[PDB]
Structure 1
Amino acid sequence: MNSDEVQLIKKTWEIPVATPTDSGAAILTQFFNRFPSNLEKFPFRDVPLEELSGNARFRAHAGRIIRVFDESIQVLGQDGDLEKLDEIWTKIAVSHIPRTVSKESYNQLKGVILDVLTAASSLDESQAATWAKLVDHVYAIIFKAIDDDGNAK
């Protein structure tokens, strides 16, 4: 990723990261609206869709997605970037093994994250592609740590 691309990610991230609560809720509500089976993994599985963002555990997970991306973006373009991303995302992958989060489930979330960011920062196609390169990189890291069903390899 060239220096222009890193800068673009950093600068466009400033908008959605300014509001972790709303931005994370946009991601996670969309995930559950499109792909409701994923609700069942959480303790808030029976909370009505319109009430999800009021649930504290929903808010915690929503905020985690934003914060982990923020941590990831912070390391870009500087020494140790690849190592630090591998660390971050390997740990995320292993953390979900006890919840059998499948590769399909991750891929469901992937498209929703990119959708939310594209809208939030008004990304053009080229800018969205730069974001997709980052996300695909981190997904490579996740996916070398799990089988298709989300178990350890």
Structure 2
Amino acid sequence: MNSDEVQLIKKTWEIPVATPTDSGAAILTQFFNRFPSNLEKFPFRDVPLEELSGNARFRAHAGRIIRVFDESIQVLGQDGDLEKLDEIWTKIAVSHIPRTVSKESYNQLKGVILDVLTAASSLDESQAATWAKLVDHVYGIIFKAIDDDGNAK
């Protein structure tokens, strides 16, 4: 993406990153409510959906997923940002391989993340398309590490 696109992503990210736990909670809540198969991968799998948003593990995990995005967005536009993104997102792919996270499951979360960010930052259609470019980019990095079922390629 170009400099203007990088600008727009940094600027609009300011809103959801202001509240990392809440933003990550929105992502996770919507993910699990729409695609609960994925909840079985997590150690809090047995916590009822009604109690999940108050669970300490869920809340801390919310921050963890936002931190990855924040680190990624900070490096955007830096010299060697492509290589730095490759490192960040290959590390994500490798840590999820033992969890057998399928491409289908990654793509389920992809749509949720874009929906949550579109809402949070009141993105219009052109701004949302810019975000989709970034997310498609980092997904390409994940997907080159894995087969369709989430095993090492």
Q: State the alpha-carbon separation in 2 of the partners of residues 34 and 105 from structure 1.
A: 12
Normalised by the length of structure 1, the TM-score is 0.98
1:60, CA displacement in angstroms?
Answer: 2.6
Aligned 8 A contact 2:24 2:66 in 1: yes
Deviations 1:85-130 (A, max 9, x none): 0000000000001110110110000000000000000000000000
Most deviating of 123-132 and 58-67: 58-67
Aligned 8 A contact 2:31 2:108 in 1: yes
Deviations 1:7-64 (A, max 9, x none): 1000000000000011000000000000000111111111111211212221232212
Q: State the alpha-carbon separation in 2 of the partners of residues 52 and 91 from structure 1.
A: 27
Q: State the alpha-carbon separation in 1 of the partners of residues 60 and 104 from structure 2.
A: 22
Q: State the alpha-carbon separation in 1 of the partners of residues 73 and 82 from structure 2.
A: 11
Structure 1 counterpart of 2:104: 104
1:68, CA displacement in angstroms?
Answer: 0.2
1:72, CA displacement in angstroms?
Answer: 0.2
Normalised by the length of structure 2, the TM-score is 0.98
- Secondary structure, counterpart of 2:51 in structure 1: helix
Aligned 8 A contact 2:146 2:152 in 1: yes
Q: State the alpha-carbon separation in 1 of the partners of residues 8 and 80 from structure 2.
A: 20
Structure 2 counterpart of 1:91: 91
Q: State the alpha-carbon separation in 2 of the partners of residues 70 and 131 from structure 1.
A: 14
Deviations 1:62-97 (A, max 9, x none): 212100000000011120100000000000000001
Q: State the alpha-carbon separation in 1 of the partners of residues 50 and 74 from structure 2.
A: 33
Q: State the alpha-carbon separation in 2 of the partners of residues 81 and 115 from structure 1.
A: 25
Question: Are 1:66 and 2:66 matched, yes or no?
Answer: yes
Q: Which stretches in structure 2 are left out of the alignment for 5+ residues? A: none
Aligned 8 A contact 2:21 2:60 in 1: no
Large movers: runs of 4+ above 6 Å: none
